[PDB]
Amino acid sequence: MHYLPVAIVTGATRGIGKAICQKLFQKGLSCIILGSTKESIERRGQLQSGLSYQRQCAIAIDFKKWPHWLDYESYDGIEYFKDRPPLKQKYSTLFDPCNKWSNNERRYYVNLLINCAGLTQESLSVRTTASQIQDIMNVNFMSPVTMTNICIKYMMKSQRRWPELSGQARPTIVNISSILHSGKMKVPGTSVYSASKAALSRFTEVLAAEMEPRNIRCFTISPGLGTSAPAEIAEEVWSLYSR
Amino acid sequence: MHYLPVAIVTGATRGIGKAICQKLFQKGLSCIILGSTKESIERRGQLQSGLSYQRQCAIAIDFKKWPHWLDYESYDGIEYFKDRPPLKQKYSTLFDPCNKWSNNERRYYVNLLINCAGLTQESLSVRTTASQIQDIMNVNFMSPVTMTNICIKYMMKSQRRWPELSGQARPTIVNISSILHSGKMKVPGTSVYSASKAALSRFTEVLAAEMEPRNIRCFTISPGLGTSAPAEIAEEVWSLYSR
Numbered sequence: 389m390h391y392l393p394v395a396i397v398t399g400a401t402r403g404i405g406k407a408i409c410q411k412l413f414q415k416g417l418s419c420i421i422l423g424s425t426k427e428s429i430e431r432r433g434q435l436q437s438g439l440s441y442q443r444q445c446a447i448a449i450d451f452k453k454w455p456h457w458l459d460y461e462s463y464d465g466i467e468y469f470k471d472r473p474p475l476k477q478k479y480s481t482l483f484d485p486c487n488k489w490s491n492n493e494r495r496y497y498v499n500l501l502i503n504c505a506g507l508t509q510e511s512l513s514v515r516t517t518a519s520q521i522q523d524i525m526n527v528n529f530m531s532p533v534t535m536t537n538i539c540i541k542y543m544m545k546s547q548r549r550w551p552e553l554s555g556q557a558r559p560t561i562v563n564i565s566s567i568l569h570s571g572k573m574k575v576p577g578t579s580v581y582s583a584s585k586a587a588l589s590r591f592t593e594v595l596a597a598e599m600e601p602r603n604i605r606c607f608t609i610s611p612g613l614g615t616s617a618p619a620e621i622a623e624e625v626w627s628l629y630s631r
Numbered sequence: 632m633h634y635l636p637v638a639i640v641t642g643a644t645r646g647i648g649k650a651i652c653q654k655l656f657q658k659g660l661s662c663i664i665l666g667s668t669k670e671s672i673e674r675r676g677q678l679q680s681g682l683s684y685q686r687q688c689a690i691a692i693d694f695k696k697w698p699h700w701l702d703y704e705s706y707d708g709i710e711y712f713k714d715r716p717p718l719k720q721k722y723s724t725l726f727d728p729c730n731k732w733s734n735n736e737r738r739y740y741v742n743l744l745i746n747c748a749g750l751t752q753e754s755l756s757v758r759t760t761a762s763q764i765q766d767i768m769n770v771n772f773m774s775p776v777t778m779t780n781i782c783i784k785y786m787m788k789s790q791r792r793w794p795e796l797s798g799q800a801r802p803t804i805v806n807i808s809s810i811l812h813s814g815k816m817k818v819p820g821t822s823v824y825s826a827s828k829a830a831l832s833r834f835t836e837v838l839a840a841e842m843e844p845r846n847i848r849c850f851t852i853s854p855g856l857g858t859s860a861p862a863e864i865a866e867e868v869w870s871l872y873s874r
């Protein structure tokens with residue numbers, strides 16, 4: 389029996405999340421990509437350059453609709469292939485792609501979660517409405533907290549269901565913050581955005597202490613706007629996961 | 632015409648908020664105390680020791696019900712007096728006590744907001760449900776953000792309505808964070824609580840940059856569980872406001 393690790397990467401349609409996905413794919417991981425909408429995830433040489441057992445799909449979840457998205461009966465998604473066109477389909481859960489990909493000889497399992505989704509603010513605090521604050525916090529913080537908790541539960545359940553997974557990299561959560569989370573860079577129009585990323589960073593730090601005796605790794609990375617290359621962050625992610 | 636400054640203090644029924652209220656009252660400010668419920672705000676020598684024009688009331692707002700509480704038609708409150716029993720009554724807004732207290736010769740106006748309300752977590756992240764995350768964030772972060780924004784708007788409007796208020800301490804926001812917001816103290820069962828306070832702190836720092844050219848002061852203070860005396864924090868608050 390072959391165990392094939394999978395990464396879930398939120399905000400993977402562009403920016404840092406996309407770069408992380410590209411890195412994980414080159415390193416042989418199967419990937420579950422998240423974007424905000426059907427249209428967004430609809431968006432060849434990458435797939436061709438991949439290994440035979442390697443799989444990739446994308447799932448649309450609008451994180452603004454937290455906590456309601458937790459309760460959806462199914463999610464819209466698209467599967468990608470080496471030598472055939474993309475297939476639009478429904479997934480019952482986040483982890484359903486793993487069940488579809490698996491058979492008697494190959495067990496696909498989520499071993500890595502990357503929270504990279506982000507919604508910018510671009511309004512002065514006093515101009516920011518309740519629904520806008522709600523949107524920013526739902527995407528940046530509440531949704532990744534939920535993502536983290538459901539993935540950890542799944543990761544714990546997976547080790548019980550598949551004893552040989554003790555022989556593998558440890559289950560890992562990486563949360564991507566922002567340079568705007570702390571320090572001297574205080575940009576007008578980013579008060580709640582900066583707060584949301586400070587929350588995500590701190591949550592992960594405390595979560596790491598709860599998770600250490602459970603052998604689950606929890607890391608946070610704070611990229612620049614000074615500035616950081618998506619490719620460099622992706623390398624840092626891989627380094628932390630493979631260390 | 633006499634202008635009498637008022638402080639709004641959330642989480643003023645106990646702990647640090649209560650200590651801050653006691654300090655502000657001894658310093659001659661009128662106070663609007665917030666607690667979570669009717670029963671809570673219902674809870675003599677303090678009032679007697681106060682000045683003749685000095686007023687105090689308490690208002691119940693359950694911050695868990697964010698953003699719905701913004702839309703309530705009225706709020707339950709209680710007014711306190713030197714030489715008569717407490718009077719239960721309805722307030723149409725946060726700033727309605729100021730309108731009730733004011734007359735032709737005395738203008739009560741809010742000049743200071745202290746966000747001190749806090750809801751603890753006491754559950755491991757993986758055991759924390761969506762509704763519990765929502766409760767923690769609503770009380771600790773979303774509600775104080777809304778409080779800050781509505782008070783700033785009121786403060787700006789007040790200076791337009793009462794030109795002589797240019798002659799007074801500048802309008803001030805103080806947000807009380809926690810030592811659990813950053814650094815080495817990472818307590819299991821506090822992941823979202825710690826995150827919420829990190830958010831509040833960062834929000835205030837960025838807000839301060841937006842507010843500097845508007846001559847509105849925004850401060851944050853991070854008390855200990857190592858540890859800090861409520862009285863010392865109250866002194867720090869007064870020091871920042873009167874500096």
Ligand SMILES: NC(=O)c1ccc[n+]([C@@H]2O[C@H](COP(=O)([O-])OP(=O)(O)OC[C@H]3O[C@@H](n4cnc5c(N)ncnc54)[C@H](OP(=O)(O)O)[C@@H]3O)[C@@H](O)[C@H]2O)c1
Pocket residue numbers: 398399400401402403404405422423424425428429449450451452504505506507508509510511527566567568575577578581582613
């Ligand atoms: N005003 C600010 O707050 C601000 C200002 C200046 C600079 N910056 C710095 O530079 C950063 C760049 O941000 P960016 O927009 O370019 O981010 P990005 O990382 O390039 O893209 C955001 C990702 O998050 C996902 N996402 C957005 N909304 C979502 C939703 N409702 N549900 C699920 N996923 C969602 C996106 O998916 P889709 O593709 O589906 O949308 C996308 O993959 C800023 O965020 C900040 O670090 C921030």
Ligand SMILES: NC(=O)c1ccc[n+]([C@@H]2O[C@H](COP(=O)([O-])OP(=O)(O)OC[C@H]3O[C@@H](n4cnc5c(N)ncnc54)[C@H](OP(=O)(O)O)[C@@H]3O)[C@@H](O)[C@H]2O)c1
Pocket residue numbers: 641642643644645646647648665666667668671672692693694695747748749750751752753754770809810811818820821824825856
């Ligand atoms: N698990 C944790 O998260 C944790 C653990 C250990 C230590 N600590 C450290 O020590 C601190 C002590 O906290 P505490 O409970 O003693 O806080 P507190 O400051 O003594 O009291 C909380 C204040 O917030 C108000 N508040 C609570 N819920 C509210 C709601 N829904 N709406 C409006 N206002 C509300 C309260 O009003 P009412 O009186 O109406 O309730 C009260 O005035 C901790 O919070 C933390 O800094 C935290």
